[PDB]
Every structure is written in structure tokens, then in C-alpha cells.
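Journal club prep — side note

Before the paper discussion, L.F. wants everyone to see what a predicted structure for a comparable chain looks like in C-alpha cell form. Sequence:
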Amino acid sequence: MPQTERQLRVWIEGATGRRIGDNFMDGLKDGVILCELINKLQPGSVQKVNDPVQNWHKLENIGNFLRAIKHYGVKPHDIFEANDLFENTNHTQVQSTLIALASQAKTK
């Protein structure tokens, strides 16, 4: 295993720039850095990323990011669902997703 969650931060945070200035899990809920991150690996994944000012905006960024990664290569079983992250129900599932995404990015 690459790590668990510590590496997840330094990894993606570096890609975009934002150092998740808040909760690690909650920060992902709004969906911004992750969406910006995938665009790096998979072209045009979430280019039209909406600012998480409102509420439905987050749902959009999360949906595009997950749908893109699920098909991109990462298995759904190893991917948090839009509702899980948004509702913040699944915590381990959220981090586990990034772990799998790492293997894909590395191969590419």
C-alpha cells in the first residue's frame, strides 16, 4: 500500500496548489482540487468546475470527478459515491479511492 491518507494530501494538493485549508474529508466535499486533479490525469474531466459557493455546485464537481474516475480505470468498489462524500457518510471509502487512483496515474 502507498499510504493511507497522509500521502493523499501532499500528493493531490501539490498538483493543484490548494493545501486543503480545512477538514481533509470535508474539503473534498466541496469538490475543487480533486476535480482539478483529475483534469491532469484524464483530459477534460472537470474543466467546467463550478465554485462551491452554493450547494448544488459541489454535487456537480463530485459527480463529474467520480464518473470520470470510475470509467477512467479505478473500480467503483474502490471509489466513494457522490452521496458518500457529500453526506460525509463514508470516510474510509473516500480516502481509499485516492489510493487506487494513484496506481492509475503512475502507470499513465
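L.F.'s comment for the group: Residues 1-108 form a domain with the Actin-binding Protein, T-fimbrin; domain 1 fold (CATH 1.10.418.10). Keep this in mind when we get to the figures.
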